[PDB]
Design an enzyme around this catalytic site. Sequence first.
Site, PDB file in Angstrom:
ATOM      1  N   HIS A 168       0.890  -0.831   0.077  1.00  0.00           N
ATOM      2  CA  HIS A 168      -0.099  -0.595   0.074  1.00  0.00           C
ATOM      3  C   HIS A 168       1.132   1.281   0.744  1.00  0.00           C
ATOM      4  CE1 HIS A 168      -3.974   2.290   1.185  1.00  0.00           C
ATOM      5  NE2 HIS A 168      -3.165   2.105   2.423  1.00  0.00           N
TER       6      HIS A 168
HETATM    7  C1  LIG Z   1       5.013   8.464   7.378  1.00  0.00           C
HETATM    8  C2  LIG Z   1       4.709   6.950   7.799  1.00  0.00           C
HETATM    9  C3  LIG Z   1       4.535   6.818   5.957  1.00  0.00           C
HETATM   10  C4  LIG Z   1       4.142   5.618   6.543  1.00  0.00           C
HETATM   11  N1  LIG Z   1       3.952   4.414   5.252  1.00  0.00           N
HETATM   12  C5  LIG Z   1       3.651   3.852   5.201  1.00  0.00           C
HETATM   13  C6  LIG Z   1       2.749   3.163   3.577  1.00  0.00           C
HETATM   14  O1  LIG Z   1       3.081   3.952   2.489  1.00  0.00           O
HETATM   15  N2  LIG Z   1       2.234   2.236   3.667  1.00  0.00           N
HETATM   16  C7  LIG Z   1       2.453   1.098   4.272  1.00  0.00           C
HETATM   17  O2  LIG Z   1       1.962   0.094   4.278  1.00  0.00           O
HETATM   18  N3  LIG Z   1       1.899   1.663   5.539  1.00  0.00           N
HETATM   19  C8  LIG Z   1       2.723   2.823   6.300  1.00  0.00           C
HETATM   20  N4  LIG Z   1       3.050   2.621   7.066  1.00  0.00           N
HETATM   21  C9  LIG Z   1       2.192   2.933   8.873  1.00  0.00           C
HETATM   22  C10 LIG Z   1       1.609   2.640   8.536  1.00  0.00           C
HETATM   23  O3  LIG Z   1       0.861   3.845   8.657  1.00  0.00           O
HETATM   24  C11 LIG Z   1       1.001   0.808  10.125  1.00  0.00           C
HETATM   25  O4  LIG Z   1       1.340   0.819  10.356  1.00  0.00           O
HETATM   26  C12 LIG Z   1      -0.824   1.323  10.144  1.00  0.00           C
HETATM   27  O5  LIG Z   1      -1.643   2.787  10.206  1.00  0.00           O
HETATM   28  C13 LIG Z   1      -0.978   0.342  11.486  1.00  0.00           C
HETATM   29  O6  LIG Z   1      -2.794   0.252  11.668  1.00  0.00           O
HETATM   30  P1  LIG Z   1      -2.596   0.373  13.041  1.00  0.00           P
HETATM   31  O7  LIG Z   1      -3.999  -0.818  13.394  1.00  0.00           O
HETATM   32  O8  LIG Z   1      -1.538  -0.481  13.635  1.00  0.00           O
HETATM   33  O9  LIG Z   1      -3.114   1.874  14.048  1.00  0.00           O
HETATM   34  P2  LIG Z   1      -2.819   3.131  13.593  1.00  0.00           P
HETATM   35  O10 LIG Z   1      -3.192   2.652  12.174  1.00  0.00           O
HETATM   36  O11 LIG Z   1      -1.751   3.583  13.878  1.00  0.00           O
HETATM   37  O12 LIG Z   1      -4.054   3.526  14.351  1.00  0.00           O
HETATM   38  C14 LIG Z   1      -4.476   3.825  15.520  1.00  0.00           C
HETATM   39  C15 LIG Z   1      -5.065   4.432  16.352  1.00  0.00           C
HETATM   40  O13 LIG Z   1      -5.024   4.410  17.604  1.00  0.00           O
HETATM   41  C16 LIG Z   1      -5.413   6.121  18.089  1.00  0.00           C
HETATM   42  N5  LIG Z   1      -4.862   5.548  19.504  1.00  0.00           N
HETATM   43  C17 LIG Z   1      -4.140   5.874  19.961  1.00  0.00           C
HETATM   44  N6  LIG Z   1      -3.831   5.337  21.400  1.00  0.00           N
HETATM   45  C18 LIG Z   1      -5.261   5.855  21.834  1.00  0.00           C
HETATM   46  C19 LIG Z   1      -5.734   5.689  23.555  1.00  0.00           C
HETATM   47  N7  LIG Z   1      -5.194   5.895  24.171  1.00  0.00           N
HETATM   48  N8  LIG Z   1      -7.385   6.051  22.898  1.00  0.00           N
HETATM   49  C20 LIG Z   1      -7.938   6.358  21.372  1.00  0.00           C
HETATM   50  N9  LIG Z   1      -7.186   5.892  20.537  1.00  0.00           N
HETATM   51  C21 LIG Z   1      -6.339   5.735  20.206  1.00  0.00           C
HETATM   52  C22 LIG Z   1      -4.709   6.437  17.047  1.00  0.00           C
HETATM   53  O14 LIG Z   1      -5.438   8.645  17.176  1.00  0.00           O
HETATM   54  C23 LIG Z   1      -4.566   6.296  15.770  1.00  0.00           C
HETATM   55  O15 LIG Z   1      -5.871   6.847  15.196  1.00  0.00           O
HETATM   56  C24 LIG Z   1       3.789   4.364   7.515  1.00  0.00           C
HETATM   57  C25 LIG Z   1       3.729   5.196   8.955  1.00  0.00           C
HETATM   58  C26 LIG Z   1       3.870   6.165   8.863  1.00  0.00           C
HETATM   59  C27 LIG Z   1       4.263   7.052  10.201  1.00  0.00           C
END
Ligand SMILES: Cc1cc2nc3c(=O)[nH]c(=O)nc-3n(C[C@H](O)[C@H](O)[C@H](O)COP(=O)(O)OP(=O)(O)OC[C@H]3O[C@@H](n4cnc5c(N)ncnc54)[C@H](O)[C@@H]3O)c2cc1C
EC number: 1.8.1.12
Lengths: 482, 482
Positions: free
Chosen positions: A460
């Site tokens: 992605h």
């Molecule tokens: C700049 C950047 C570029 C990236 N580019 C890519 C890419 O091109 N392709 C790719 O595959 N991956 C990429 N990634 C990695 C990808 O963004 C993450 O791996 C992914 O979003 C992880 O998903 P998740 O479900 O673990 O949590 P996340 O998507 O991080 O969501 C976590 C959520 O928890 C919420 N939250 C946290 N603590 C609390 C709390 N205590 N109470 C309530 N809500 C809370 C936050 O606001 C957030 O919305 C990138 C990361 C960054 C930072």
Amino acid sequence: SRAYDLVVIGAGSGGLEAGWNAASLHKKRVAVIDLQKHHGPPHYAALGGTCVNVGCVPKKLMVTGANYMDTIRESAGFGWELDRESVRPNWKALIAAKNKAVSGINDSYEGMFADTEGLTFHQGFGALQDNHTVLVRESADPNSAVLETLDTEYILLATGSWPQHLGIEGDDLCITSNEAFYLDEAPKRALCVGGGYISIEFAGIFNAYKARGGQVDLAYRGDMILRGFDSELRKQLTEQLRANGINVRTHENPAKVTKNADGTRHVVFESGAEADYDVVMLAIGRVPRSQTLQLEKAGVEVAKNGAIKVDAYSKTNVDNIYAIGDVTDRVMLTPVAINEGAAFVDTVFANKPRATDHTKVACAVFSIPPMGVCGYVEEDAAKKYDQVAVYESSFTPLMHNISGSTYKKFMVRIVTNHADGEVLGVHMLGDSSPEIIQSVAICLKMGAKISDVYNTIGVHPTSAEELCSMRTPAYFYEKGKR
Amino acid sequence: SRAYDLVVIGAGSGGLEAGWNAASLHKKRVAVIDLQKHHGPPHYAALGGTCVNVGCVPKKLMVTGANYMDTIRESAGFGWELDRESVRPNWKALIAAKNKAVSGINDSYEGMFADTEGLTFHQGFGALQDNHTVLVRESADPNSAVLETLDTEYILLATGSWPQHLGIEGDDLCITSNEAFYLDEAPKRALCVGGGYISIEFAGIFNAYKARGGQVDLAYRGDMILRGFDSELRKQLTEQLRANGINVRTHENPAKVTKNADGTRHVVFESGAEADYDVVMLAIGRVPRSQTLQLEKAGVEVAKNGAIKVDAYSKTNVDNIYAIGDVTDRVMLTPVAINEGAAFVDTVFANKPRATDHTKVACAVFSIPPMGVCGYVEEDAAKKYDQVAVYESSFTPLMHNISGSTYKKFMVRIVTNHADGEVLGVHMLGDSSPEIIQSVAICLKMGAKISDVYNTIGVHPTSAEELCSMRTPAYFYEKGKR
Ligand SMILES: Cc1cc2nc3c(=O)[nH]c(=O)nc-3n(C[C@H](O)[C@H](O)[C@H](O)COP(=O)(O)OP(=O)(O)OC[C@H]3O[C@@H](n4cnc5c(N)ncnc54)[C@H](O)[C@@H]3O)c2cc1C
Ligand SMILES: Cc1cc2nc3c(=O)[nH]c(=O)nc-3n(C[C@H](O)[C@H](O)[C@H](O)COP(=O)(O)OP(=O)(O)OC[C@H]3O[C@@H](n4cnc5c(N)ncnc54)[C@H](O)[C@@H]3O)c2cc1C
């Protein structure tokens, strides 16, 4: 006269693979014959073949040039400022750069001959005397000065094909792709005649290098351009060419072409429609180039269209004579002709009979936007299979919501045997689809199932991960449905 | 305490997938909690998570914009004549378009919650009181006003990661990638601290949108950037970054940062070198975000760096509390987190245990030029199998000889188990390699061998075609290189 293990007539994609492999790996004494050494007029192809001189290599360079029209327009959405009213394309520079590149490759092939043991190049027209001797003459004319007589055990014909012409009034005022590569001026108004990929590729090149206010028309006899391709993809491509300003005149065919006073051509279409153009390019087909070889004096015979009849291992009826590439009219693509040239050398010299699989061969159309395609179109799959499932998706990349080219839909369609789950064909429209399809072709020559594709984890953000995101069929065919 | 089947803390990539599935597919009652509905400060990530808001989706738009600097420059070789002095970037136009695109996506997620009966969004900081009640407070302070106390059957922890800082003096004068998405003006001089994909990708964004005479430096504490990627590719990416003007400073780490009267920041490095920059962005790491969840109050084990420890089905030591995505420190990619959310709902609500395969997962680095990689680098493979073979090819695309960009080598490296030829890894550097690695990942999930690869006929002319062209190893490992 000299004695050789092999004479290759045609030093193109197939003949050069074959000759080189036979001389180096098998230490054979090989003669390769072609018409000239450097690209261009008079004979257009030369050392290396149609693909390097007047084919795949110059057209990809010219289509890359053509794409800059859309990227300089699309950059504005992402904040690039420039004086766009000053932008002017320069056809002359494009052709000068292109010719420099193509001549580089030609000089490389000459080096290749100096580096190797029993491989010699012979320049002239090869014609057969009898099944064991080939004449190199001064021209295609049977009464031209015979330069050399080569005595051989095995003969390999790999003369390729040539542009098909229309039997019409004023055909002589029309050009083909061959002359299109050396045109001195970009046309203002131009007609590309034909529904195949060569027509569509050139229409996108002329569309970008034209003087503004100019026009390129694409005239085709049938209802949708690009027969043999997925019917939905042909329908969407048509509208995307129209959206970039080329006029796809479907069910139109030339009737008369007449030279106007000021050099331009006037054309009368079969509908009594008329229009004037700077250039009229016929891109209506390619016929096997076999007429001049005198095949008959060696007993080898052809099909009506000129194709040299060959069995699966590329042997003709006279056994010591083989034929490969476009003259064989199997799959007219460079990797296929190369694969056949290699298989032939295992079969006669390594004595390991390899037949070339002309099945699940992937290909691309470098139109703007491009297509990458592999396997079966659903109409054909539904005639051969019981239960055929068609999966489809379309999206406009987020990207084109910002560039302003919202008409650029990425489309991916997958045909399966629904009993089996085996993927029978994948057809894609959009940027990067020629890059994406090569790997999908490995998946298909391996026998993937649609579960293989949706169990892979996506990368992605890419367009290609759609391949891994399709689980429910759109519709099916039990002999029919849609 | 209220009545829920599932409460998901963290409405992101994994979190939202699981919550939608549990509700529309399994009719469960599920509460999803997050800090914010729209992107931006103060919380940066919001409904949809890091990827939608301050991640993959904004980032990729911004690197496509940055790429126009190279193609506008490259067009000149293909004859596109224009006023080269008129060309200037406008960073404000870029982040204005990015903010509307991400605002659209945020609106549709609110739409989603209106279109599904048992799914609700709760805004606040979720923390656990007991393994069946989750309270959403006003802030991350344990003592803050409890806004809601949801009572639940299962808890899914999916809080992602957050940028890691340096404990140096003036850390508060540095930004992370979060703030870099809302910068009001593009830095003229910038410092990217870190060697992973995120500082690499931002170095290229800043390099393209900088005012002329500007400079971006990339500082990394180690010997070579992109630790954990193929070593030949890392070396070659560094040289291509330098040829496009970015200054890669190895064995370099900041010591203190002070603000200049000017407003710029003065950086003293640990070597004793000094320099001024408009922006100093830290992209040194991302740490699992479990710190304010009160995980000890439910007795769930955390792994020192913050990673919530889990088994293959994403279950923690407490059997009704599961954790997915970045907080578990497994593969920090959006696809993997989504797949883990899907797998979770199958196992607990569809009662069919799944588990995500975190092996053969392809990924991409949207650097200029980009990279697409899948599987093992040779070093790791060599310490598991007795004979490892490495295949590589390098070539400059014909087009880059016509454009100015002669340094843009395309490179493909394939690691094999030489016992049966099973492909263990494919690592590519060059344009379109993110798009090519997606379908190569499918071949790898199906157990492809190098012979599957060279027995597929090529699609010509493409870069991807190089995949099918590699028959002979460059070198091997029989425990050590040979
Ligand atoms: C700049 C950047 C570029 C990236 N580019 C890519 C890419 O091109 N392709 C790719 O595959 N991956 C990429 N990634 C990695 C990808 O963004 C993450 O791996 C992914 O979003 C992880 O998903 P998740 O479900 O673990 O949590 P996340 O998507 O991080 O969501 C976590 C959520 O928890 C919420 N939250 C946290 N603590 C609390 C709390 N205590 N109470 C309530 N809500 C809370 C936050 O606001 C957030 O919305 C990138 C990361 C960054 C930072
Ligand atoms: C405009 C255009 C675009 C194309 N684009 C693509 C593409 O992108 N990808 C792709 O895969 N394929 C493409 N093709 C098709 C590809 O060029 C051919 O399929 C391929 O070159 C066929 O190889 P061959 O060995 O059969 O013959 P060729 O490569 O055509 O070579 C035949 C050689 O024989 C020589 N010759 C002819 N008659 C004689 C004679 N009597 N004596 C001596 N020498 C003789 C000719 O001069 C020529 O050099 C394109 C073709 C054209 C025309």
